[PDB]
UniProtKB/Swiss-Prot annotation:
Gene3D superfamilies referenced in this protein's UniProt entry, alphabetically: P-loop containing nucleotide triphosphate hydrolases
Effect after changing residue 23 to R: In NS3; impairs GTPase-activating protein stimulated GTP hydrolysis with unaffected intrinsic functions and a virtually functional effector interaction
Gene: KRAS
Protein name: GTPase KRas
Keywords associated with the record: Acetylation, Cardiomyopathy, Cell membrane, Cytoplasm, Deafness, Disease variant, Ectodermal dysplasia, Glycoprotein, GTP-binding, Hydrolase, Intellectual disability, Isopeptide bond, Lipoprotein, Membrane, Methylation, Nucleotide-binding, Palmitate, Prenylation, Proto-oncogene, Ubl conjugation
Residues carrying a glycan: 36
Reactions it catalyzes: GTP + H2O = GDP + phosphate + H(+)
Activity regulation behaviour: Alternates between an inactive form bound to GDP and an active form bound to GTP. Activated by a guanine nucleotide-exchange factor (GEF) and inactivated by a GTPase-activating protein (GAP). Interaction with SOS1 promotes exchange of bound GDP to GTP.
Transmembrane portions of the chain: none
Motif residue range(s): Effector region: 33-41
GO molecular function, one term: protein-membrane adaptor activity
Positions bearing N6-acetyllysine: 105
Length: 167
């Protein structure tokens, strides 16, 4: 029976969650993609010699702490916590996203990967060392990515699948 992996891509609006997901599924960089549209994607892949189905939720829209929104995010098995390396607030917001995940999953060891997106941009404001240290404190991997060039994209999602398998 082919295993399905439910991944949820989270992070501040504009960090590149939609661009990262479309790059993984369709292998192209979409410049303009409505910031309010939330959608699901599927991709069958082989990871470490095992065929599996990725079911990815590309989150969007306003902040909502309803019983229903909490139960929907509770269905996620692994979370890609994305920030943009050229926006310090998106990086500081990561503390909030992790605490919300920890709260709804009622667990301190939820499969998760920290992702620094837009590594193609020269206007960096978040130091790789600062991100690596935050990831160490949480005990999770840190993958730098660029949805524009495809740097680290397969690596970000496949790393999250491996975190779920071990868990
Ligand atoms: N240079 C660069 N721009 C990116 C990258 N990823 C996303 N963008 C741009 O950042 C903006 C927001 O991307 P989007 O995927 O809509 O972000 P979301 O709100 O997190 O889904 C768009 O103009 C994208 O083209 C990246 O890795 N590099
Ligand atoms: C999706 C997510 C979340 N989104 C936000 C957020 C913050 C600010 C803005 N502007 C937009 C969204 N903070 O956490 C993370 C995963 C776990 C849960 S549980 C739940 N009810 C969530 C919601 N909403 C969440
Ligand atoms: S829209 C189908 C769907 N719902 C999800 C929740 C969490 C992770 C992936 C998902 N896909
Ligand atoms: Mg989006």
């Amino acid at each position: 029976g082919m295993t399905e992996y439910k991944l949820v891509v989270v992070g501040a609006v504009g960090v590149g969650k939609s661009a990262l997901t479309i790059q993984l599924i369709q292998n192209h960089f979409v410049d303009e993609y409505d910031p309010t549209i939330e959608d699901c994607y599927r991709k069958q892949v082989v990871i470490d010699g095992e065929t599996c189905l990725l079911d990815i939720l590309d989150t969007a829209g306003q902040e909502e702490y309803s019983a229903m929104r909490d139960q929907y995010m509770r269905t996620g098995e692994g979370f890609l916590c994305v920030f943009a390396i050229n926006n310090t607030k998106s990086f500081e917001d990561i503390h909030h996203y992790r605490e919300q995940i920890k709260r709804v999953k009622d667990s301190e060891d939820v499969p998760m990967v920290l992702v620094g997106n837009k590594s193609d941009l020269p206007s960096r404001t978040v130091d790789t060392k600062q991100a690596q240290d935050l990831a160490r404190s949480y005990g999770i991997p840190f993958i730098e990515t660029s949805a524009k060039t495809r740097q680290g994209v397969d690596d970000a999602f496949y790393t999250l699948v491996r975190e779920i398998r071990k868990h």
